Structure formats: C-alpha cells, structure tokens
C-alpha cells in the first residue's frame, strides 16, 4: 500500500484528508522534522532528498513530493470521486490555478512565522501580503458556491483549509474575513476531515 | 489569438518562451507593474484581479494566471511538441513535481530581493534557503540528462532558467554551481529563447 510521510498539522494533512475523501488505502509514517528521522527510526532524507513533508511513497516504491502534485496524483487514482474536474475540461485548469495560487501565494506566505530566526519587519510584510491574498479569496467565495470550485468540493479545499488551519495557532485573526471563517468551519465539519484530524491527533 | 500580459524579464518570460517553442500564435501586451496599467492604457486589474503577471488571455476571452498552469495549458495545445510528458504517464508527474518545486521553492525564494522594504536578515535567509535548493538542482543535474527531465527539454526548463536569469541582476553568485551555470547557458542558446529575449528587449 501507499505510505504517507507527515508531520501532525503540517501541509501533509491535506493529502491525508484526500486519501480519506477518496477512500484510498495507505499508512501514515510520522516524520521528525527536526532530525529528519521517521518514527520507525529511518533516515527521512533517504525518502525525500529535499527533506520536507509530505512525501508519498507508492507501491512500485517511488516517492512523490510537493503537496499540490501529490493531491493531483491522489485524485487521479479515483476519478470516479470527482475531487477534481475531469481531464480535458477547462474547469480542470481553474482547479490547478487554485492549487498553484494556494501553494505560492498562501502556503509560502507563512514562511516567516515558521522561522525561529525571522525579523519582525518580514512577518509584518507576510501578514501584509497574506491579507491582500485573503481579500481575493473572500471575493471568490462571495461570488462562488460553497467551495473554491463552487459546488464541487475538490482537492483545492483540503489544501486551502489545511493551510488556514495554522492561523489560530499563529494566532492570526481571520475575523476580517467571515466567509473564509465560514469556509473553514465548512471544511472541518466533513467526516473525512474529522477522521484525519483525529488520526493526526489534532483533536 | 491569445494575449500574453508580461513584464520584461519577469516570470512571464517563461510562458513567452514556451509560446515560441511550441510555435503558437500570440500577442504580447506589456504591463506596468507599478500602476497596473497595460501598455495600451487599459486597467490590468480588470484582466488579472490578483494583479500580477503573467496572465494569459485566450480566444474565448477567458484569462489564465499562475506561471506553472499557463505553461501546462500551453504545452497541451501542442502535445505533438513534447514540451511535456504525455497524459497518463508517471513521468508527467515528475515534470509537475518540478514545476511545483520551482514555483514555491525557487521562484518564491526571491521574494525579499524584489521587495523595496525587506530587512537584510530576510535576504540573508533567502539566500540561505535558495542555496540549499540549488544544491539539490545541481544534484539532479549531475545525475541527469541535459535538462531537468533528462533528455527531453520541457516547460520546466523554460521556467527554471527564466527564474535563475535574475541572479546576475540581483548580483547573486552561481559559481558554486557550475552545472547550473552550464544549464543556464544551455537554455539561453536555444533560438526560441533568443527570440523571446530579443522580443522582450533583454538583449
């Protein structure tokens, strides 16, 4: 079966949710981000050279990295589950556009806050940017169906919601964006999200 | 025909190259990043809300954003040109893995250096990280064919090379990575890259 290397609460949570949403078979392997050792004592940089999670280990033994590609790859194992617009459609690009946007624009923006050694002028700017980005999302949400894609819940929602999960912890105020707060609660109420969050110990 | 909104030298250069590599028909529309106005005086935030380049305007009139999605979308207009592994192959994911990696890991890392108001402790860390990332690329290059994908020149090479284009300007030393320097010269010697660089005024 497939093996998912994760850190509780980390972006690895997104694909973790998706494996559950698509009802795929997998095992979680916990990784220590500090010492790059896996829970079983293995050397995680043997798994993922770039040395971050999530990393997805397939049956044929290969490893996939990069949150947004892992999600795609997962969704395509079960096209019948519609976690993603079908190949060939233009809507499909709209989803990819979201995954890219979430990856560079939002996921990255939390760079500073996760760095022990970051100026404060940077975290200031991070929030600065991060805020301008959330304005756009609240826009789309105001214009759009319940999920990023409208009525279809997709992999983009597992990614976005997972990343915004961090704010409470970093103690960042989302109040300014009620729809986004609504969206977050919407995501977390989903049984597969529940089950993963419980599984990862987040509850 | 398709319309590409760009800023000379910007990441928009990547898709610009690809349009030429695939021999597609398009028009360049220059955008002023300062005032979000297009060369023709139009309001660019009407085009791309998120307000950055590149943005790709299709014939049916819609707009695509996000460098790595635009590249995909372009490559799929001409699958006969092999700028991308064919749908269904696993190699295809390897390419996507590169596009994601370049996007978050490298393209983003230049965040600070492009910001008028960035601490120096941040640009320090940027280079710090940026360096660790280039170590991996030099690895792959040392293990791999001439391009990121090995023997197939792909969209990932237009993206990576375009982004590393910046270092000379930011005056960042690549000496420590000869293969990468070799790779860069390899990219720039390609007639379609030439033609785009000339077209954008970079020569």
UniProtKB/TrEMBL annotation, chains A, B:
Record EC number: 2.5.1.18
Keyword Metal-binding: no
Keywords noted in UniProt: Transferase
InterPro entries: Glutathione-S-Trfase_C-like (IPR010987), Glutathione-S-Trfase_C_sf (IPR036282), Glutathione_S-Trfase (IPR040079), Glutathione_S-Trfase_N (IPR004045), GST_C (IPR004046), Thioredoxin-like_sf (IPR036249)
GO molecular function, one term: glutathione transferase activity
Residues holding glutathione: 11, 36, 53, 67, 107-108
One of the Pfam families matching this protein, by short name: GST_N_2
Enzyme class label: transferase
Residue ranges occupied by any GST N-terminal domain in the UniProt entry: 2-82
Domain GST C-terminal per the UniProt entry, residue ranges: 88-203
Superkingdom to which the source organism belongs: Bacteria
NCBIfam families: PRK10542.1
UniProt name for this protein: Glutathione S-transferase
Protein species of origin: Methylococcus capsulatus (strain ATCC 33009 / NCIMB 11132 / Bath)
Origin organism lineage: Bacteria, Pseudomonadati, Pseudomonadota, Gammaproteobacteria, Methylococcales
């Amino acid at each position: 079966v497939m093996k998912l290397y994760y850190f509780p609460g980390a972006c690895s949570l997104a694909p973790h949710i998706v494996l559950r949403e698509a009802g795929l078979d997998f095992e979680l392997e916990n990784v220590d981000l500090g010492t790059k050792k896996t829970g079983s004592g293995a050397d995680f940089l043997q798994v993922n050279p770039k040395g971050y999670v999530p990393a997805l280990q397939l049956d044929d033994g290969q490893v996939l990295t990069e949150d947004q590609v892992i999600l795609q790859y997962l969704a395509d194992l079960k096209p019948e589950s519609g976690l993603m617009p079908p190949s060939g459609t233009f809507e499909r690009y709209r989803l990819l556009e979201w995954l890219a946007f979430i990856s560079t624009e939002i996921h990255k923006t939390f760079g500073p806050f996760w760095n022990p050694e970051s100026p404060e002028a940077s975290k200031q700017i991070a929030l600065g940017l991060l805020s301008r980005r959330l304005d756009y999302v609240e826009d789309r949400l105001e214009a759009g169906g319940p999920w990023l894609m409208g009525d279809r819940y997709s992999v983009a929602d597992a990614y976005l919601s997972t990343v915004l999960g961090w704010c409470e912890y970093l103690k960042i105020d989302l109040s300014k964006w009620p729809r986004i707060l609504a969206y977050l609660e919407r995501n977390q109420a989903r049984p597969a999200v529940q089950a993963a969050m419980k599984a990862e110990g987040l509850i």
